[PDB]
Amino acid sequence: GDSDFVVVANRLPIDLWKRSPGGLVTALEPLLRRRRGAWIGWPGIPDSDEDPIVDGDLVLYPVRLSADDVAQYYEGFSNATLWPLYHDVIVKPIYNRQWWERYVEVNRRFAEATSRAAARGATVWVQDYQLQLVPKMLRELRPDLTIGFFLHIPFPPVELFMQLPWRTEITDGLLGADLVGFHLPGGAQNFLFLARRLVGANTSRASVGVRSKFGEVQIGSRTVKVGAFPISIDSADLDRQARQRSIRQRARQIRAELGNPRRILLGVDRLDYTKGIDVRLQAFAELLAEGRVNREDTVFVQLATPSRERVEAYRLLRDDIERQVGHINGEYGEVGHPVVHYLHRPVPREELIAFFVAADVMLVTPLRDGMNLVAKEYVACRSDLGGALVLSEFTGAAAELGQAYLVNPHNLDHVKDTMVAALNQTPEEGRRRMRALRRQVLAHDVDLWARSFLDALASTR
Amino acid sequence: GDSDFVVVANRLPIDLWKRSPGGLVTALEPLLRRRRGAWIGWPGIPDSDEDPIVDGDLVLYPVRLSADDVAQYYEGFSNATLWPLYHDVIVKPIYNRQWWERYVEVNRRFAEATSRAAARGATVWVQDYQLQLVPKMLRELRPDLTIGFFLHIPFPPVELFMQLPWRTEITDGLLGADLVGFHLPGGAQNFLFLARRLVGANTSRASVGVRSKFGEVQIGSRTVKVGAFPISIDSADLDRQARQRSIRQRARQIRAELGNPRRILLGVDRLDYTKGIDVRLQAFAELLAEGRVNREDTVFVQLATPSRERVEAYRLLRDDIERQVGHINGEYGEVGHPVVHYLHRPVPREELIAFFVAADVMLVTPLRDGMNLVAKEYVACRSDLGGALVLSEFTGAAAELGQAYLVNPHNLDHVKDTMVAALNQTPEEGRRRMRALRRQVLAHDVDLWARSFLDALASTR
Amino acid sequence: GDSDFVVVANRLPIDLWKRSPGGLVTALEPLLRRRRGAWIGWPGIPDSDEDPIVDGDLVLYPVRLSADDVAQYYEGFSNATLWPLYHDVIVKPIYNRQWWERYVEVNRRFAEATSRAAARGATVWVQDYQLQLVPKMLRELRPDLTIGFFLHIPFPPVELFMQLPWRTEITDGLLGADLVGFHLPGGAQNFLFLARRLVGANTSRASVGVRSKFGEVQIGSRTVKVGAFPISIDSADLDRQARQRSIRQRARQIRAELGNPRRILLGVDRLDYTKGIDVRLQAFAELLAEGRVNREDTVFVQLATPSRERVEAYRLLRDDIERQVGHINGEYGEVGHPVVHYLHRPVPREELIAFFVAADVMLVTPLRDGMNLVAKEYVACRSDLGGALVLSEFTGAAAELGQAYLVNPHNLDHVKDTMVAALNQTPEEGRRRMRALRRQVLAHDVDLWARSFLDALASTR
Amino acid sequence: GDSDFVVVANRLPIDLWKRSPGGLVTALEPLLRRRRGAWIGWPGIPDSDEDPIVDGDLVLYPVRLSADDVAQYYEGFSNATLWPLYHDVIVKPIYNRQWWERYVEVNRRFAEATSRAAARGATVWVQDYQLQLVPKMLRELRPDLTIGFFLHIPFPPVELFMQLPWRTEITDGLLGADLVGFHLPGGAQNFLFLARRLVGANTSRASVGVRSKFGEVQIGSRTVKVGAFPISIDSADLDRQARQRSIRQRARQIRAELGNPRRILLGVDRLDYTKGIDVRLQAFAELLAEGRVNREDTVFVQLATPSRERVEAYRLLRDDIERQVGHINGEYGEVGHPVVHYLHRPVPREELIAFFVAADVMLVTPLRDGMNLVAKEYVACRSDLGGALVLSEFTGAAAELGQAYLVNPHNLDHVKDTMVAALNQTPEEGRRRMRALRRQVLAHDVDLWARSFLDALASTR
Numbered sequence A, B, C, D: 001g002d003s004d005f006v007v008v009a010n011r012l013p014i015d016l017w018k019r020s021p022g023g024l025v026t027a028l029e030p031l032l033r034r035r036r037g038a039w040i041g042w043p044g045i046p047d048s049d050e051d052p053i054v055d056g057d058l059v060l061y062p063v064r065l066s067a068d069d070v071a072q073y074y075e076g077f078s079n080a081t082l083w084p085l086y087h088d089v090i091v092k093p094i095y096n097r098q099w100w101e102r103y104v105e106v107n108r109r110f111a112e113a114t115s116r117a118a119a120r121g122a123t124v125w126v127q128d129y130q131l132q133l134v135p136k137m138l139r140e141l142r143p144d145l146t147i148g149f150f151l152h153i154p155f156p157p158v159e160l161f162m163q164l165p166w167r168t169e170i171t172d173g174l175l176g177a178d179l180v181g182f183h184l185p186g187g188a189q190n191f192l193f194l195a196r197r198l199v200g201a202n203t204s205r206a207s208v209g210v211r212s213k214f215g216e217v218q219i220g221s222r223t224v225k226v227g228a229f230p231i232s233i234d235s236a237d238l239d240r241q242a243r244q245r246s247i248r249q250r251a252r253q254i255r256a257e258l259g260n261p262r263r264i265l266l267g268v269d270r271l272d273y274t275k276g277i278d279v280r281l282q283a284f285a286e287l288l289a290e291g292r293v294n295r296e297d298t299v300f301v302q303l304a305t306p307s308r309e310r311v312e313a314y315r316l317l318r319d320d321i322e323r324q325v326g327h328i329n330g331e332y333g334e335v336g337h338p339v340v341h342y343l344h345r346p347v348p349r350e351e352l353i354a355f356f357v358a359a360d361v362m363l364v365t366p367l368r369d370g371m372n373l374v375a376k377e378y379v380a381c382r383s384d385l386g387g388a389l390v391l392s393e394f395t396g397a398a399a400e401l402g403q404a405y406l407v408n409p410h411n412l413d414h415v416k417d418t419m420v421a422a423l424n425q426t427p428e429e430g431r432r433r434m435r436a437l438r439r440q441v442l443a444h445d446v447d448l449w450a451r452s453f454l455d456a457l458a459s460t461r
Ligand SMILES: OC[C@H]1O[C@H](O[C@H]2O[C@H](CO)[C@@H](O)[C@H](O)[C@H]2O)[C@H](O)[C@@H](O)[C@@H]1O
Pocket: A152, A153, A231, A270, A369, A370, A371, A372, A373
């Protein structure tokens, strides 16, 4: 093809069609302004054409997937095998050979579409866990390409990874890249150890740095670079948006509609068993039972975005969370005044920002999360320096946001102590923490992340 | 003893101590004003004395029960064997011989306490399913006594009753009475058939009337009278109470606190699997899904009084209902505005009356209920002629309250159609129904009921 | 059509094709020898033709049903609504309007096929719970016909029947017959009461006799006869078959293959929650635990024929029973010697007869069963007068087989006592019981049953 | 005290009393023959004395534990927190603060008993996961002691270990030792990484060898040695025992009692969710379904020893396995001939050896296991060179027994392929493998293991 920079991701960067706002596709804009750029992905509709679509800024290459393809490659292998395994088997992975076979077939199709788009010697950046076979497949089709891969979810310890019957194929798949990146040094180090243990490759032994001190894996005549690049957001843009009059007005209206509580706790997540929503609710219930939170002036809002309804584990999770909600309100609410407000629906971005602005305590308590950008978004929104972030240690974000109230979500006693502390912090202490968190997040944005990864990738040439 | 009229019931008519208001004990007041009256029952505290307590109006005879006695006789045999069996095995009865043995032992203890209190030739009125052995035991101890028994819960069909391993002992127990009463002719007729089938007694074959046309069972030289006496409330007293300024003010405040909805649906029940609370919630959810109820101006309040927490079936039921609540609000509510308000706690009587006055639609949808006085209380409160009663056919109340919106709770399509009809009735049609229901309930009160039963019992002399 | 006697049943009397042996179709042979006979039913294959098939003896009229028809009318309405409801709601019936609508549509199709076959003034005999609408539909199409209906499963008490949202339609459906028959007087009496309560018809009030003393329901100008006709088997034929050399040789071989136990208990059932298989296993386990049965010389064989695998309740039941089997053997067996042998597969008739001949104790312990012919078959096979029948009271068979060891399956203590008694009976006492049971079963066979029903039906002319 | 060599373990090496045979206590005999030896442990009876008991060979120091102590420290913290966590969270660990507090209290009690027994400068060897706090506690009480600790179960990856709310306390506890040993280099390397990540200690970075190339952790002025020492059995003694006439006679009798099958598969385990018993049964069922194993001449014997009945996860596991057993026999067995024989009971050692000798295929398929000595015992018993070992990769044993048929138990397709391969191996290939496995196991016995650990520990002086 005629593109010298190519992104490969499970989905095209569109909404159903118009270009989706923000995200990676926006972070890359000033590179696409000087490159012949392409994006390979599934357009989100079954059995579409694979005819290229010019976006002026980008050229989009659609990948044809049937509904059955999506069921077995995506909702099957990706979300019911890889997702739970990589997130510390919070639920039991399902090992299914037909899912594997479709995952291979679909990965090859992405590889073919990439080659079609990629000019000679082009730079290719493959995204995330659905496409781990693509780098090797692409190198075999197109040895002229420079190939980067970034994993957005955690890379699990070897003891868990080894469960995968296709462990070697996945590892070889990733080793097809010139650069393999993870959010955290821990993931990079697991990958190095896996390369030694499973594949028998020679690797570097030193600790892996942050955006520096890269590891290496020797594969025959070529070297694979391994690095840690923690993703972030467009901090400045969110900071700006959150100051808008209409957002501030909505935040005040939210508090009014909640009956003007003294304190609002907020959870914002896709409904996933990795997110520790159940832990927040358990902690809140026990605090109310113990009289350590005031049921008359404190309210918890949980906004759950529907996710993966076709996967049974998610339906069961929804059932447990919805039981907790009903239970806590039945026990501690009053007619016309719940202590927990729970919504299971998509939420417009501007409404979410208004909730960040209204919330006195942000509860981000995943059991395991690659990064978690909701924590960083809350921080970027609080230019008033109000609020408080309660953050699980088991997120990538916890490595950068040390000034937050950090918790081990498995330590329920300390989660409860911490929620009380966040709710009752002095104004000055709250400001001190938020000021420090904002300094970090404003300085370490998605632009820094993307430039760091691409600089590392370019250096493999 | 020195009492010529004696009531026998599982509990003494007290709150923990002071005399409990209303109820049977108040209905009997003008008889106790001309009788030497006694009440036999458990005082609600473990291992108490059995020393008589003069209430001036009554003499109370406490029955000593240990916590283990209560666990096996009451929460065991009474509530986990008899209760589910008599209510059409909505949950599976547990047949446990140790529970049976304690039930016999405790029933004998009540019989002994009764004899202690009862003067020669005294009239005795035994209450309800916990004490079905007492009449026979008492007749053996005291053949001089006139003995009535009234069952407050349904009497099941023979096909289900026969499951009970101690079916014959229970039947003989009831046949010790001079008069056996039920709310409905159906129960009386089941009892007659059971007497023929199981005990081989000669009985009458005709239909049993309401407070008339009594059946009979011949037991050797004596005859057992069998009748239907549908219980009611002190209709006039509730009518009066509901007109009080403070009640009306509270009802307005309730509507204000709910955000001034156009329509309020109300459920008021002890949390029991017989009450069909799950059906109301399912119907409401599907109506919202179908857009047939307006989620912006219609709200459902369910007040569940905690019941029998030590019984596993009740804990599981609570879990399912609380899930439904959380689910429906997550799907159709807004932050600061649920469509379902659910409270799991005891509610003061005056607060309940205020809710009756506020509610546009009363949802009384049991799967099976002896009478259900909540339906009649709602009617007695609506002297403004507003409101609407949606009532399950499977209640004793449905035989008298035919002007209500009657439903088969198993027919979910018709339950949904009926809720829409009740919510959207014309003012005139609503008034027509409520006027007719009030005529019935005001005329057929607890006084009429108690006099009818005691007249029938006296006639056995 | 040209048939003056017509049977209507869910399935044609064939195996897939050849005529199925025994059963109703064989009982009717000497009537078909003097009649122009027809049989209407589904041939058991989806979307077949409805072209008549001459069997010389009979003419078969196939009813076309699609796989979807079978799923909603048969496995849906018939087996997941009616079956559990009529058997005392051992599992919760599912009320589904789409199932109902298909049940109506399919019943009409059977009615149309019947009319096609039936000559003018012909006699029609409709079979069982799948076809309860056919009599009314047929009378409307063909008022010239004489119509009988026999229900092979129990008819439930009114309190349970009334749950059915289409209760009135089913009742009207049955009332289309000139004769409605049940195995037992109890079913007939429930039907009479239902006719009065639900339909408001005038009925007889007397007890219903066995093959006599019929009840009646007045429907406008015509009368519906109601009777009890307990089904049986071809007793003489089974008695004869069980004496065959090869059967006796197989029975000895069975005992040899079980390691020559002193005592064999046997269960033979379709795998259904009505059959009380779980109760047998629980009783056997507790007897072994208590050392009241000798684990070294006593063995229990349970032969479960697979049934209704597409219905979830049956899959769950299979799971529980299979757990019990594994558990009991793990606890009381030895390697090479289980105490329970369990087979989940169809069993050839001649193999079943050999098991009847080998078994010292026959365990027939349904929670609820219309008749249960397995009990009568065991009796007919034991012309050696050996063996012992343990029989649930909750079967139609218990009304005729009073000399068996009768048990209330809910009374587990007595089930256990009874199994010990049967296992250890003296030879003389065993013979006394078996001799008496055989006198009853040899005299009251399927021929007597069929003649009695047809005589009653003919008398409605 | 007066002992210069002291073993510390959860239980005293006795049966209830007499000295228990074999095991660690026998491996140490020639050291105790030249040492003043002591053993500290719970005698297995509640609230005993702590008076020392001379065994001539050893002095036993009993630790007093109440039944409540055992419930919270052992069945609670040890078996419901640590056990599932360290075995890759196959079931969800329970984090309970009261269990933790009792675990600390009990560990201190063991430490106090050790100090009481230990002479000045004595060598102390603490055993296993129940006693991980003891080394630090002991060093604080008795800085004069040389302290070794060996973990017999796996040491989990840091991502899982970090869940533990008392992660730091456990790690500090282990760091109190002069030598920390694990079966495998992987465990040692996890420990080193944990020491760096959690405790911030300086450690060695190199790979850890087998009984060599030790790691180190610097703790202030002292160094902690870290090593891998894979445990084994008394190979020669078992080899000798398995040749006994009575054992060989019993093995032949076992095959006779199974109906002389051509092939016997054997599983021998404590009933634990770590052991992968469910996987064996699933594989066997699918092979039978596929006709790849002959149901007429192949039989699977599973001997499950009862374990931890007071822990709910184990009761649920028992239920699932027992269901599988019942199911497979119901589907593929014949009356008098199951395809699966399952026993849930303790088995005498001599009976187990006879089963090893009889078994054609040994199925050792844990999901995760520290070592698994059953695999090595089978090998030591087969001096006839018959048999075949199917072994999970996820055992310590798989690192030494590479000549076995190794399987990933999560790869069910390959487990099935492998069982077929083992069942149908040529005699020569079977012998080749068994000969090689025996060379390893005969050379690497419990004596080599114990000497290696004690040499390493002595070198810390
Ligand atoms: O499953 C697709 C998900 O991808 C994103 O989340 C992952 O990537 C983020 C950015 O690197 C991380 O913050 C996060 O921890 C990862 O799980 C996306 O944000 C999610 O909405 C998607 O569900």
